[PDB]
Amino acid sequence: RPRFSFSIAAREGKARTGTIEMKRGVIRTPAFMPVGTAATVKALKPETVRATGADIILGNTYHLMLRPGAERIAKLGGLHSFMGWDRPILTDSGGYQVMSLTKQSEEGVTFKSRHMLSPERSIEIQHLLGSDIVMAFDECTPYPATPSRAASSMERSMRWAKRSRDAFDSRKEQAENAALFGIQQGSVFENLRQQSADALAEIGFDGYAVGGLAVGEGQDEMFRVLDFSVPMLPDDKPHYLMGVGKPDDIVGAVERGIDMFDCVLPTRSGRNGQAFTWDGPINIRNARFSEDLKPLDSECHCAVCQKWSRAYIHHLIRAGEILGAMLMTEHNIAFYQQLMQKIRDSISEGRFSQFAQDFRARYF
Amino acid sequence: RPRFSFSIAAREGKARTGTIEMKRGVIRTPAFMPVGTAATVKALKPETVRATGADIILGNTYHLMLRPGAERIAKLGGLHSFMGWDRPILTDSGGYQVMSLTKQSEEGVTFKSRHMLSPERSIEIQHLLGSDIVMAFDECTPYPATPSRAASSMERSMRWAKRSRDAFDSRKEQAENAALFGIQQGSVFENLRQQSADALAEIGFDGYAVGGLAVGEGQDEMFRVLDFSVPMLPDDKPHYLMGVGKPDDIVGAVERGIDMFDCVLPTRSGRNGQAFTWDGPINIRNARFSEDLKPLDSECHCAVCQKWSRAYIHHLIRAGEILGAMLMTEHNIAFYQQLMQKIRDSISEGRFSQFAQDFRARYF
Ligand SMILES: CNc1nc2cc3c(=O)[nH]cnc3c(CCNCC3CCCC3)c2[nH]1
Ligand SMILES: CNc1nc2cc3c(=O)[nH]cnc3c(CCNCC3CCCC3)c2[nH]1
Ligand SMILES: [Zn+2]
Ligand SMILES: [Zn+2]
């Protein structure tokens, strides 16, 4: 396999389906990337994550850089060996959680013990973790933002994107074996999104993320911004929407040209008792499920739905049992993978628009 | 398979190895029975519990009778279907936790919402759960106890044992498909243990437990009491030591004629960071393990020891990750199963005394 190859096998409107080939494996697009901790996903073994159909996971750089430490993980053989996940891993730059979870400067961000995270350190940390897809270090502009603040922020991010590029390229091992994605900013403003797209393509990346969304604007506004923003990115490279989202968000985003997604929702939801189904989410804690012998979802192919009832999982979750978290998480991640499979196959067959419509009608 | 058949295949001194055949499967003795919740074991899938080598699990009657309720579990198809464990389950009578975790009378025990647990209700609850091995309802005498209190308590327990027997036998389905064990009491007093053994054998049970130990007396005293107490039980029936114990306790108990064990230690320990090894327990939280790439135990055949390092599990546990609980629990239950396998094979081969000595020398 090559370091990085994206191939589009089929199209429908702005939607695309294909594959990313990397040294550690192939990624089917549109892709959902489960988000971890030190665990590939909370409460799942790597073999379980794979079994649900994931081709790639998102490594939680912010968590790992604090404990156990990136240097330590490198000393131990890198994140893949540590975790026991031998397929691709995309690492976040760690800035979103830093700024979310502090003193900003052109150098980077200082945060509390106290540390500085700059584009160079971020790229270095991702290298130490042994990331396959490295994210440039950026600033996710708060929402709402005035045009001036949005432009200032975006401009800084583009300068950081160039620093990210140069840091990546100066490291031979990383440059030859990993890929680097740039992230578009500009809040909700068409002109700033265009400037950002142009700056990133001038620098040149292996893939392009749409940043700065799913930060409070709501689905209509996010879709409006995606409508003009994704066509500004190079068509022949993958498009990654960061931090999205609910099933309906993912479908509408694919309709707008997005190829890759990450979100904590299936795990967070699941730990909290929310299960995804083709008829909408359900909250398994509700008394209505205490004697319901049906699986979480009637059609789901996951091991959980093959083996246990709603009634059992209802009891586990109300009792605070770890096994309830395990089973809910496996189901919800499997559900997300089945959604992505359905999306890929429908695009491949030229019937994605009908799938999107049937999906929504039933889900809502 | 028969309802219940115990066969002794080999002996060494007072130690025995054999099998219990039941309708839902065969149990290799000496046996360790992992203890659950609504989960066969906390943080494990039933398939994982089986994979570690368990032939039978202990159903936590006290927990289940409160939530979700025995009637509900019966409505849902019984505990085996609810949990997804299709092999034998031994259920506790629920009194130990009631008295541990209240107003005592000849009828039973009342406890807080408020309820009464009597021998008849206990047998009924175990029936509703669909237990394969039913325990008589008894009183675990506190330690220390004066001879008069020990005798009073023991006498009551023997009366409850007869009520337990009659309640079990009056229920046709239970009598034909499950087994019933009686429990010996008498604190540390030889004469009361003998009276208890005699009362139980006069009633007649499928197996006999040694109750009233591992309640604060310490290993020397427990072994002293086992020395005279186990030979009082029928030789041709299984001997169950309730609530024991650490690996060293199990070995010494088998040397004294015990065939079956239950304890929460491998799960509790494991969730707390204690891993069992052939060189003794280790606490994986200790800084000494933060960069140790060896498995939890050098010889262990479990999936955890095949796949992850001490260093990784150290991080998981310190981070409070569910996956750390999962992995520690799987290892410790596997460790207990491997100990029991080593015990069975050494008895079978006539070298249990040498195994007991090598085990202790290395473990301590
Ligand atoms: C939910 N909305 C959301 N919006 C986001 C915008 C951005 C951006 O503009 N740049 C970078 N990252 C962004 C992120 C982070 C995406 N997930 C990172 C995971 C790693 C471990 C835990 C989370 C966003 N998330
Ligand atoms: C640790 N010492 C100990 N000593 C015990 C004496 C007795 C007795 O004399 N009779 C009955 N049960 C007894 C028990 C209970 C044995 N485990 C039951 C499990 C079900 C779910 C959680 C625990 C004892 N445990
Ligand atoms: Zn499912
Ligand atoms: Zn192990």
What would you note in describing this structure?
- Two copies of one chain form a homodimer.
- With 364 residues, chain A is an alpha/beta fold.
- Chain A has one domain (1-364): Alpha-Beta Barrel (TIM Barrel), CATH 3.20.20.105.
- Helix content of chain A is 45%, strand content 18%.
- In chain A, the strands form four sheets. Chain A has an eight-stranded parallel sheet with strand order 4-14-13-12-11-10-6-5. A three-stranded antiparallel sheet of chain A has the order 1-2-3. Chain A has a three-stranded antiparallel sheet with strand order 7-8-9.
- In chain A, helix 10 (219-229) links the parallel strand 12 and strand 13 (239-241).
- The longest helix of chain A is centred in the last third of the chain and has 27 residues, at 322-348.
- The interface between A and B is medium-sized, with 33 and 33 residues.
- The site of one copy of the ligand CNc1nc2cc3c(=O)[nH]cnc3c(CCNCC3CCCC3)c2[nH]1 has 17 residues of chain A, from helix 5.
